Assembly symmetry: C2
Homo-oligomer: 306 residues x 2
């Protein structure tokens, strides 16, 4: 079975790290920090990595039951799986699938249904993923809410993410920090089973990022969110499971109107993209442009500069 990538434009696709559309392509240097996202991680031959799962709507969602931290508006969620089955902390993954993979304050809504009569309720909620009590790998996360009384115990509860916040009395855009992983088991613990950090290895190359802008809900947040693979590429590679014939797939970004190649890039087998560029650059692309797999190449292939 021949390898390929989807015929989808950037704007037709979805971020693999938050449930929002892609907007644009960005490249920049990343040697000064660690790029190790856990969502949007998949090999070209269809092996899921990190905390990656298949639907974009489940990314940064939580489900479980909640208990009230009395004397506060905070609730502890005992996590369940997406289908309400028991969450198993012994599974060899860093955290439940779809767990946020950055340190920040994610605002959304906590909803709940009472099983017996079908009464429902929803409240503004924020999860601080840098919190000592953010421990999704252990099965527990804390939400700050706008109620101290309305949520019931032992009832199905869901967090739907909306956006991110920042404290405007402090330096603008200082949070979130999209490249800082949470400590998934809480303070003084070490992460396990992580998808590896990524970096270009070839001289003159940089990572190519698939970029969105997260909604902001308060203050002056850094809303940039870069994934290594569109969620649709994760979905497609998982479906196709085409064997990799080398460690590097050469892709051309093509303008279907002219048939002209705008740029070429390397799709690495372990699931990220590099380009030949030095410096920060927002790519200018025609909106109907798309990626096309042309050939498997060896470890010595030099990309045309873009």
């Amino acid at each position: 079975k021949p390898f390929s990538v989807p015929v989808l434009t950037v704007e037709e696709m979805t971020n693999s790290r938050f449930p929002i559309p892609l907007e644009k392509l960005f490249t920049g240097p990343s040697s000064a920090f660690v790029v190790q996202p856990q969502n949007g991680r998949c090999t070209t031959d269809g092996v899921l990595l990190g905390t990656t799962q298949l639907s974009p709507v489940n990314i940064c969602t939580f489900r479980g039951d909640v208990t009230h931290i009395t004397g506060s508006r905070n609730y502890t969620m005992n996590l369940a799986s997406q289908n309400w089955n028991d969450y198993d902390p012994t599974e060899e993954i860093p955290a439940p699938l779809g767990t946020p993979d950055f340190v920040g304050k994610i605002q959304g809504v906590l909803t709940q249904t009472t099983r017996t009569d079908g009464s429902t309720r929803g409240h503004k909620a924020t999860v601080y993923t840098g919190s000592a009590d953010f421990a999704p790998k252990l099965g527990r996360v804390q939400f700050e809410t706008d109620t101290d009384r309305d949520f019931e115990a032992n009832q199905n509860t869901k967090f739907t993410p909306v956006g991110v916040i920042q404290d405007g009395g402090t330096t603008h855009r200082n949070e979130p920090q999209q490249w800082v992983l949470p400590s998934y088991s809480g303070r003084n613990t070490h992460n396990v089973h992580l998808a590896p950090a990524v970096a270009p290895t070839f001289p003159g190359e940089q990572l190519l990022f698939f970029r969105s802008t997260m909604p902001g809900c308060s203050g002056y947040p850094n809303m940039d969110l870069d994934c290594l693979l569109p969620q649709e590429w994760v979905q497609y590679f998982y479906q196709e499971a085409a064997p990799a014939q080398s460690d590097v797939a050469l892709l051309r970004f093509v303008n279907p109107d002219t048939g002209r190649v705008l740029f070429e890039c390397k799709l690495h087998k372990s699931g990220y993209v590099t380009v030949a560029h030095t410096g920060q650059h927002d790519l200018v692309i025609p909106p109907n442009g798309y990626f096309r797999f042309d050939s498997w190449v060896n470890q010595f292939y030099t990309l045309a500069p873009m």
Copy 2:
């Protein structure tokens, strides 16, 4: 001719095409008593999108645009933009903007906004009543009820993220939303246009097979059932594959890969919906790894074995 197929995905791995939430189960029931004409999750087997259907699972029931405050209230009117912030064209031959809600109800979510000059941001609880006289997305305007009369700015990018549905608990429980009642997309006293057709089983002993989710509820006692005709992933897959239909009916088998055995067969109609041989309302009991597989194109006389 490119061979037809459906994705190897379990039900729980897939997504509702009518609200941005996972599928939970398969359901069949009679539908002769009401009109089944959803506009999201509509696609032919050879990949032609229909109704208000588009490819993004996360854009379903989202709105983007700019907002104007309705003086003397906590309500805002959104002037709609396209999903990529381009101008919305009301003359396009579609029922409404792609992804527009396709049922009458009160959808609660959050309106968020960024001020372009300094990156200041804001978010507020918001509800859109899709049965409202001023729900007119086809014309490019929708009204949102919020918890502020002052915080949103004009001429700034504003997004509605859907969360769930509400109901008025002082009235008969589960009386809303009404998932099979289409909104009036151009507002009060208007007629919808360019609709994907209503669907019904035609064959004796057959019913629609529905891909079912439960919408989150945010207040009251809502009817949270939400049935789509196709998983969003099947829309995405047919769009990509564009495999020609060789007849009007694709026979599918629902298979348990753990055992290699067929649990039931069903018909995937070319115009994009599924029927099974069953009478009455029934939640299907399926193994967790079960999935659909294409068997062959059949003629108009093929009879399904009872489900």
